[PDB]
Design goal:
This is part of a larger assembly, with two copies of chain A.
Chain A: E1 2-5, E2 14-17
Antiparallel strand pairs in A: 1-2
Protein name (chain B): Spike protein S1
Disulfide bonds (chain B): 31-39
Region (Disordered) (chain B): 6-41
């Protein structure tokens, strides 16, 4: 996956294209907790 | 209830949106979240009558 945004900080808008082994692979919402996941 | 934005440092590329609100500054001294001197609210009501 790849995390897109301008400044994060719940001020501008972000994008959260990810990928997994399930069927729901793309999940785009306004989030701020995704800083450095693994 | 209806609102518009009239203060922005830059322009808008077509088909884009901006829902954020802040306190605009057009001087050297920053507002730092204070809406006082040289600190404008960029979102202003239409005031329809």
């Amino acid at each position: 996956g790849w995390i897109f945004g301008t400044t994060l900080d719940s001020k501008t808008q972000s994008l959260l294209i990810v990928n997994n082994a399930t069927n729901v692979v793309i999940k785009v919402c306004e989030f701020q907790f995704c800083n450095d996941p693994f | 209830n209806y609102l518009y934005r009239l203060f922005r440092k830059s322009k808008l590329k077509p088909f884009e949106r901006d829902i954020s609100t802040e306190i605009y500054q057009a001087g050297n001294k920053p507002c730092n979240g204070v809406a006082g001197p040289n600190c404008y609210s960029p979102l202003q009501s239409y005031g329809f009558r």
